[PDB]
């Protein structure tokens, strides 16, 4: 069922970001929806891989060929890793945040994608949607947002 797929995706994101946040492993994971992401998938290394927390983690290990860029998730696949997302030029984004967050914000401005960031400098988990930044959300907060947004 798609329902079981969507819940597995939530769990996959929750576990991998939780693992990566404890270890300050930067990460950037964009989930596409009605708005196509195919142009950005094509900038990356194709994976077309089953979604799992273990793969998400392995991708973002630092100084590895897959980690520099965004993971894009399309349907029930990790479509691509090391993809480019457009950067927000928004002057409202805090300057202590980094390029991952600016990239997470840029794509949320031009798609309806849900994107999730792990800061390598703080371990905070953030989320972007519709040009909004949810900064350093708690585990419970991330759970409800992903539940609300990714389960249809
Ligand atoms: N357009 C983009 N799309 C996706 N990833 C990007 C883009 N531009 C930069 N990145 C990623 O942003 C990271 C920038 O590395 P850098 O050493 O500058 O850390 P940083 O931006 O301070 O980190 P953080 O935001 O996690 O605190 C690199 O992984 C680079 O792959
Ligand atoms: Mn599962
Ligand atoms: Mn790097």
From Swiss-Prot:
The gene is dacA. Homodimer, required for active site formation. It catalyses: 2 ATP = 3',3'-c-di-AMP + 2 diphosphate. GO terms for molecular function: adenylate cyclase activity; ATP binding; diadenylate cyclase activity. Belongs to the adenylate cyclase family. DacA/CdaA subfamily. Changing residue 69 to A: No c-di-AMP formation (construct without residues 1-80). Disruption phenotype: Essential, it cannot be deleted. It is a multi-pass membrane protein. The keyword rRNA-binding does not apply. Optimal activity at 0.5-1 mM CoCl(2), also functions with Mn(2+), for a construct missing residues 1-80. Catalyzes the condensation of 2 ATP molecules into cyclic di-AMP (c-di-AMP). c-di-AMP is a signaling compound secreted into the host's cytosol where it triggers the cytosolic surveillance pathway (CSP), a host pathway of innate immunity characterized by expression of beta interferon (IFN-beta) and coregulated genes. Expression of truncated proteins (missing first 80 or 100 residues) in E.coli leads to c-di-AMP synthesis. Its EC number is 2.7.7.85. It is found in: Cell membrane. One of its GO terms (biological process) is cAMP biosynthetic process. Residues 1-139 form the DAC domain. The keyword ATP-binding applies. This is Diadenylate cyclase. GO terms for cellular component: plasma membrane. Its cofactor is Co(2+).
